[PDB]
Symmetry: C3
């Protein structure tokens, strides 16, 4: 039990002294190592990455003068900008005014060919989001030239009027926005900001000269991406200020700096029915003479959306371990490829065609030696398994099918090469129809099992193997068999029928080992009737019938 | 050195021709491959996934008429909606009005059983967030029926008044919001939007008919998730418009489309003390007659939060390599399982009980052959390691413990099977108390080391192995030992005491190899005293004392 | 073909009964298993993690009284807070007022040493964001003491005036904000909220006593992180309420609770030129006597940014499979380490120096046995490969280089150990200048190939190996060679020149196997001229020239 615990299994290997294969192995190992290292360091797969949480604080500075009796106006942050001071801020670039609005009946603004021509056309009680009123069903003259439906809404109405061109607040392109970005990686417990001590304040952002200046001129934002602020100012738009944080929190590779990029977020070619641009209608309410009045301003502008994103990486042992474990199996590529080469070039097909056709692959025949020193083929031992050898042939035949009452001599199997004998050890001092030697005899086994023993020493007519002197020296010589038995059992009693049986079995084994060198084939070999019966004649049984070949399993 | 570099180690293998094991191996390989492929393609583990950055632009369109002297009002986007046009927008569904507010003393609104009954109950200088004023400590009659505390706050007060039921702006359910969603994957450098050219504009969203229409009717939003807009309109709520982007950026599998889903974000059963619903109090300031007055509107509505989330996948070679490396080791499952089967069925326990009990597992005994052709057991060579063989027994005994002065014959070890001899090679032409053969002699070694040599040829009384003829043929025959020595050293000088010593050692080795076939056991074998001293008698030393067994290590 | 499919390859192994190595293997296996399990469960690597989508709803409650003719004011949520009720909300802590603003010429506010001293200093048409007006180029006296430039802007101007100290709305520290957080994991289809049924309402958040109370006192927020609300109230700031959701959605380990933490998001030491603190200028517009007037309020306060982040993990089989596959290769660590130990201690370097220097590593010499039972070295069979043995030496010499016309006897290779012979099997019954034995003869091969056969039996002068009796018994004995041939071919015809050739080849093989035990070396061995020519003399050819050694490949 404890001995079972205290065991270590190590694979048997074959140390090959080959320049080609060693060079290939080291080249592939180096390639795998290089790619693994490159992937680890480039993608920082050894680091735990966490997304950031951002806080944005914007301050827009800039004033515009608008001339529109002539009225001279001044526009500051309490005028053209909203209380928006975070991820988004709005800069007004144009506007439409409608002073003194009261909820009453009035003609809807004639625009986009909405002028009415017939009273029946207008509907009663119909909600009109385009005009923002309820039509009363009666057409009325908005102007002496054209007529429009009557809506109970805020009056006077100015819906559908185009934004003035050129934009009144074009000067917004000269306005400067300061962006303060605070990010944190709570898992990594790291916080930083885009404005650090020792940074100049009289700077404006540029891709090259001042890439870290958080002060942006809107016109520069637009022209860095090929957008015409003057055109966008008319109907408005949405622009994006991307702030990317590719941040490394490792001490030896610490750099957490923002990268500023810009992107228009509103489609230039939005259909006129999809409300192009960016605008919003905001109203100031007041009391006049005793009635509640409203002043409506339709403000066109650019909404700047500050989009902050990024990841913060810090070394994590678990991630590195996982990556290494993932990539470890790639170091078996050399083994796989070289074993594939050995297996393929060990095939008896290359010599036939490939080598004569291509003579450059001639020295690759050495892989047969490697294969035979690397692989030990074996077959499943099954009852039908049988091996036969014919002295007129230089190979052994394996039969792995049932004998359906037909002689094993006539049964056909497949050819296999007889194993090489141990030279170091060998260097020492009315006959049956199926019989082609004349010495074979009918089987005494039951009828259903006579086919197994119906085998001859040779396939073609000739002399029996029993005529060879080695048959008598090895198989029939009682002295040699006695020596073998004593070698196994030194104090054996060479008397009785037991010794005759043991000698018979040793003779069978001797023939099997002589003609089927491998013990694997010798165990499942089948002796010819001639040799079997000569053996039995030499070492015969008493008051018993021979059983024959047993299944080793 | 370079020869050390130019080496390739390949494992020795056993090619088994088994239908069952090959079928099992291929089945398991196919299963592993199928699961790995399924996981790779379903979860898109070959792709690098990046979260998106979103910009949302909303446009709500819809007008409501409210009747509340009778006052007829019109409510448009400058009235019921806020400047919110991004990720969130607010649609007012009800309201409470309080015109003409001045900062002075007044009775707090009697609500939720807040009516005061005693002057002492009211506190002086106490902040009252429920009433939003500082109590003066004196109770006053709010109405002829009930009394309330006096607060220096905006007056007249209307706190705690329930939202009117039914909701005044019920018609908000018919209002339509257009959502424009712009997403980007900056790492993958991909941008898209939810409105593409060629999409109809007179559409409203439906799960099946118009799943890609970014125009939503609020009532439809509510009824798609079993929410009653009429009820929510009273106190308000929060609704979520989820926009999911499961986007594949690979050219051959490119589809980046949004999936719209809805979710109520406010708890229906919020406790009345936790401010249920959604409302906000916004005030319009003005000057009246010389004093600064305020108009307060408590607006109840639905805040729609557009929640945009998703990931964009693009093929990455590094991710695929990592996944493949992770899954490569799963291809050894076939080897593990089949080797486990071989090891288990090679145990000498199955034959004893399992096979007779269950006869279906009879042909699985072939795994003993596979085990013995796959594993070569070996023991750690240690000084205490000793092997002994008794000619009255068919096994060898291994002793791996110290001899505490007691004879090795009486010491007990564990039984091991003597290895099979090479048949191919063999096929060729006052006695001591511990002695059970009569031919053994006392050891001449030092007293502490006599136990090692205190061993007999047999455990039970009988004839000595020295009486066998093979002992003289193999161990004592000077001709055979001389032939062996010459085989090792052809030009050996067969004269002197050196040749006698060499013959003695060869005789020891011959006995050890004969009775312990394996060289591993023969190296650590222990000769019996009888055989040892017969050998020494045949090849005796001169002017010296025999040392005995040395430790091969 | 199908037999090729029905094959299973299993590695040959060596079962070592070693306490040290088994203990090491199990220790390393346990260590790897423990670390893998720890990483899996601690980091929850078996779970699929999804980021959350959050909705935040805030309700600030609290009223302040400000005394500033003396004016007594009341400040409620319609006064000090914005319509912000989501991820951010603003609490006003101080303010500056400027009533009755009109767009006209006026002197800019003298602050930060901006007082003008010369008319020429002021510029005409110059935008002044600091003063928020267009300078007319003429200096005018703002006050009797100091003068400032003239700006066409809103007047009276109050830019650059410091926030009053102490802060007017200090009482904001006593105000309470209720945060309702709704999160969802749409991939995992899980939603939850920070307020659950059965939670008290009269609670305020504390780290220990009430960590789950979503009602926060602002002063407590500030003092939990060492911030002085009274100081921040003057100029304002930005504070962050982090809500972390480390949520496990597995039923057996379900806990999805928020963790509240606070963080100041505005730099305390922001440069005075970077607009420290948080403020915004919001204006109320009105009509007075017929002209449009403006009231400007510069509000200083704290903007609270609710930052919600977290991940939701649920068991995923794919992730667990990937992690296990990643970590499987780490279970080969025991094999790697033990094989490294075996390889290192099998080196013939330790015995020389390490063991005598350090005697504790003495019993580690057993690894040579393990190495020789684990590895079978083999060399690449190449035409230049040759083996030679000298009977005056105890080793075989391998030559793997071309013979540039110089005798192979004088060519130097590298020494290798002759393999141990099978004891079990052996236990059975004007001479050439390069010649150091006298029996060698010149080669009859072509001139370019005579060097191969120019080899002697010994390196130093002495007796030829042919004088040994084993040479005649093994190599020249016709009986033994005939027996070997018959063993290979039992019915061989021992007549003709074919038998002589076969005997010659068998004699070459016999010498090669005798002196180069391994068949690998015997195949590429080179016979000495003396032995070769004695053999040929014994078994000579007829009407033909001998070819010599062939390349087995
Ligand atoms: N390999 C092989 N073994 C055989 C053959 N015939 C008999 N044997 C072996 O010899 C034994 C049977 O001996 P047998 O002649 O029947 O003598 P008996 O059993 O005493 O009657 C079995 O254990 C077989 O393994 C044969 O043709 N081939
Ligand atoms: N395996 C084994 N070897 C032995 C035994 N006795 C002696 N030897 C070997 O024989 C050698 C010692 O020979 P020994 O009889 O002492 O002759 P001496 O050394 O010349 O006195 C050692 O190298 C041992 O390996 C034994 O019982 N078993
Ligand atoms: N290993 C080895 N084999 C040899 C040597 N000389 C001859 N042979 C073998 O003997 C065969 C050639 O026999 P050879 O003497 O030329 O007789 P021939 O071919 O009939 O003229 C070849 O197949 C060689 O493998 C030698 O020095 N070493
Ligand atoms: C999975 C690929 C395996 C390929 C094996 C091919 C073996 C060829 C044998 C030969 O030609 O000698
Ligand atoms: C890398 C595999 C190369 C295989 C080439 C096979 C050439 C034929 C050899 C035989 O079979
Ligand atoms: C088939 C793959 C290419 C193999 C090249 C064989 C070269 C030799 O012959
Ligand atoms: C990459 C491996 C294939 C290239 C090496 C081929 C070597 C063939 C030699 C023979 O066989
Ligand atoms: C870790 C599992 C290892 C199981 C090995 C069981 C071996 C049984 C031997 C037998 O019954 O023959
Ligand atoms: C898959 C493993 C099956 C093991 C069954 C073992 C049956 C007993 C064999 C012996 O031991
Ligand atoms: C124990 C696992 C089941 C093994 C089945 C054994 C079948 C035979 O016997
Ligand atoms: C899944 C592997 C177990 C099923 C195969 C069992 C085969 C047993 C044959 C004997 O042994
Ligand atoms: C990669 C590391 C490999 C180290 C192998 C060292 C072998 C030493 C041989 C010895 O000293 O016996
Ligand atoms: C774990 C590796 C330890 C190596 C120690 C080598 C000691 C010298 C042995 C020889 O070579
Ligand atoms: C070199 C690494 C340490 C090896 C320790 C060797 C101990 C013995 O000797
Ligand atoms: C961790 C492995 C190294 C420690 C074990 C060393 C054992 C040396 C024994 C000899 O060789
Ligand atoms: C570079 C460019 O095309 N600029 C144009 C400008 O010419 C045009 O006057 C203006 C009107 O919107 O739009 C912008
Ligand atoms: C609350 C409300 O006004 N709902 C209206 C409904 O009455 C009307 O039938 C429908 C068709 O116009 O539009 C919606
Ligand atoms: C389907 C349903 O229950 N609808 C109800 C409606 O019956 C009720 O009049 C209204 C009042 O809030 O709330 C909603
Ligand atoms: C700045 C401010 O008003 N702080 C007050 C403090 O004076 C008072 O003692 C406490 C208890 O009501 O509440 C808070
Ligand atoms: C603990 C602490 O330093 N508190 C200070 C307080 O002393 C100071 O009066 C106030 C003025 O801003 O700022 C805060
Ligand atoms: Na692996
Ligand atoms: Zn016959
Ligand atoms: Zn015959
Ligand atoms: Zn005895
Ligand atoms: Zn004895
Ligand atoms: Zn010579
Ligand atoms: Zn010689």
């Amino acid at each position: 039990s404890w001995n079972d615990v205290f065991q270590y299994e190590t694979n048997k290997v074959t140390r090959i002294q080959s320049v080609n294969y060693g060079t290939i192995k080291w080249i592939l190992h180096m390639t795998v190592f290089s790619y693994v290292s490159f992937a680890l360091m480039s993608d920082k797969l050894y680091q735990r990455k966490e997304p950031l949480i951002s806080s944005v604080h914007t301050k827009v500075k800039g004033v515009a003068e608008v001339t529109e009796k002539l009225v001279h106006g001044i526009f500051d942050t309490a005028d053209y900008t909203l209380p928006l001071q975070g991820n988004s801020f709005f800069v007004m670039t144009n506007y439409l005014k409608s002073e003194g609005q009261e909820q009453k009946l009035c003609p809807e603004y004639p625009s986009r060919g909405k002028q009415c021509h017939s009273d029946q056309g207008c509907i009663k009680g119909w909600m009109d989001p385009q005009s923002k009123g309820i039509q009363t069903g009666r057409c009325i003259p908005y102007d002496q030239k054209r007529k429009t439906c009557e809506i109970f809404a805020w009056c006077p109405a100015e819906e559908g009027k185009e934004a003035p061109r050129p934009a009144l607040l074009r000067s917004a392109e000269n306005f400067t926005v300061l962006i303060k970005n605070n990010i944190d990686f709570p898992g990594h417990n790291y916080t930083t900001r885009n404005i650090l001590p020792g940074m100049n304040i009289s700077c404006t952002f540029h891709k090259t000269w001042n890439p870290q200046c958080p002060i942006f001129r809107l016109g520069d934002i637009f022209q860095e991406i090929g957008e015409n602020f003057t055109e966008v100012a008319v109907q408005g738009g949405i622009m994006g200020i991307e702030i990317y944080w590719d941040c490394n929190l490792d001490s030896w590779s610490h750099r957490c700096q923002p990268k500023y990029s810009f992107r228009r977020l509103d489609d230039k070619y939005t259909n006129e029915s999809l409300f192009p641009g960016y605008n919003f209608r905001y109203a100031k309410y007041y009391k006049e003479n005793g009635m509640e009045k409203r002043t409506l301003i339709k403000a066109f502008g650019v909404r700047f959306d500050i989009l902050v994103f990024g990841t913060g990486g810090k070394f994590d042992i678990i991630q590195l371990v996982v990556y290494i474990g993932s990539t470890l199996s790639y170091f078996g590529l050399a083994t796989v490829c070289i074993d594939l080469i050995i297996n393929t070039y060990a095939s008896t097909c290359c010599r036939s065609r490939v080598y004569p056709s291509c003579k450059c692959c001639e020295p690759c025949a050495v892989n047969e030696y490697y294969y035979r020193k690397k692989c030990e083929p074996i077959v499943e031992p099954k009852p039908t398994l049988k091996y036969v050898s014919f002295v007129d042939e230089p190979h052994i035949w394996m039969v792995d099918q049932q004998l359906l009452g037909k002689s094993l001599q006539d049964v056909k199997g497949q050819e296999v090469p007889r194993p090489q004998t141990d030279f170091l050890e060998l260097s020492r001092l009315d006959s049956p129809d199926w019989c082609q030697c004349g010495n074979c005899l009918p089987s005494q086994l039951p009828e259903n099992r006579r086919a197994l023993e119906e085998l001859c020493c040779r396939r073609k007519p000739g002399q029996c193997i029993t005529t060879s002197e080695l048959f008598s020296k090895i198989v029939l010589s009682r002295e040699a068999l006695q020596l073998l038995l004593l070698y196994q059992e030194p104090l054996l009693a060479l008397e009785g029928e037991a010794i005759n049986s043991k000698l018979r079995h040793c003779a069978y084994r001797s023939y099997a080992t002589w003609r089927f060198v491998s013990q694997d084939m010798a165990d499942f070999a089948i002796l010819p009737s001639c040799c079997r019966w000569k053996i039995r004649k030499e070492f015969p049984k008493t008051q018993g019938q021979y059983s024959g070949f047993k299944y080793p399993y």
